Structures are given as structure tokens and as C-alpha cells.
Amino acid sequence: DMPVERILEAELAVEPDPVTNICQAADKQLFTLVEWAKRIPHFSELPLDDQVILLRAGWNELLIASFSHRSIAVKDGILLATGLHVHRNSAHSAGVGAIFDRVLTELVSKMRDMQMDKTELGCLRAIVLFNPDSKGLSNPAEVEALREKVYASLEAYCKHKYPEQPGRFAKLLLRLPALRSIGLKCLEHLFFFKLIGDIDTFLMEMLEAP
């Protein structure tokens, strides 16, 4: 059973140079991510090794989803969990304008235009958490079944809250490929920042080899 009310509760429970600031905020949010995951139904019942696999595979996309949705009332910028706003022009002059703009146009602006709500966000993140394609999983079919339950609950919530928007459910799922590509590009940048070492311990562990 996968009630959207519990998923909402999970989101509400965790509510709080530019590359340095982004990194500090990300490290801090990794601790919060663990607390969020434990509130998603059935996750803590998975074998410890699997919980580890799922969080190491999904962490960067889960973090991107949160700061994008947090930033929807923000013009041309991003609200970090630390309370700091990072604007376009600031990211452009640090040499990271391209990736910043992708987040803004592909995620933030589209979340704003449709008024994606916090239950919808939480469900998308729970779907990303329960990724059955994660390597090493002791039972991928158990994770797939939990994924199926989240998106069945999501589809029923959209059809009830927004009955006049029949395409909304698909519209939500169709931000996930953008999220995946932006997550991959962010990882490349983080490995470069690690290399040109001018990064705190939890973020560092997430960038370690398995």
C-alpha cells in the first residue's frame, strides 16, 4: 500500500563563489535525504544493502528535484536550502551558466507553469527512489512493485485533484528524462570540481567508487 498522504508528510517533514555554496548545501541536504527516504512507505523494510544501493543511485536526481521545486516563485534563480539565492548571472560568471539554464528552463519554469504541487513532487521523487534498474539489488522485482504502487497512487491523485487536466499525469512523468540528463551532467561537473580541488565528507562519499 502506497498512500500519497504519507509521501506528502515525508516532504513536509524535511522542509527547511556559487559552486562552493551549491556544494555545501548539497552535503547538508544528503543528511536530510536519508531522513526523507525513511519516511517513504516500505523503504526501511528493504534489506539494508538495497537501501544503500537505491540512495547511492538516486541521490543527485532527488536533490535536483527538491531545489528546482523550491525555486518556482524565484525569477531566473535558485533557492538553496541554506537560505541563499543563486541568480543566473552569478552562475554564468562562474562558468556554470549552461547547466544552470537547463535546470531553469527544463525543470523550474515547467514546474511553475503547471503549478506542480508538493504531493506530485514527492511521488516523482519516490518513483526516482524506487529505481528497479539499480545495479546489485538483491530483489529488483520488490523495488519495481513499490515503483508501480507510487505511480498508481499518483495517477489517482491527479485525476481527482485536477480532473480538468487529463494529460497531467503523463506531463509529470515526462520531466523524468530531463531530470536524468541534468543529473548526469551535474555529476560530471562535481567530478571536475573534485579534481580541480580549490567538498565535504558525505558528498565526497557519494562520489566514491562503489
Binding site: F31, V34, K38, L48, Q51, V52, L55, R56, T201, F202, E205, M206, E208
Partner: peptide, 10 residues
């Protein structure tokens, strides 16, 4: 992966 482990345990 000690930090993630310790946090998942309690």
C-alpha cells in the same frame, strides 16, 4: 560507504 550506513542503521 560508512556515513550512509551509520545513518540508515540509526
Amino acid at each position: 560507504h560508512k556515513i550512509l550506513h551509520r545513518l540508515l542503521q540509526d
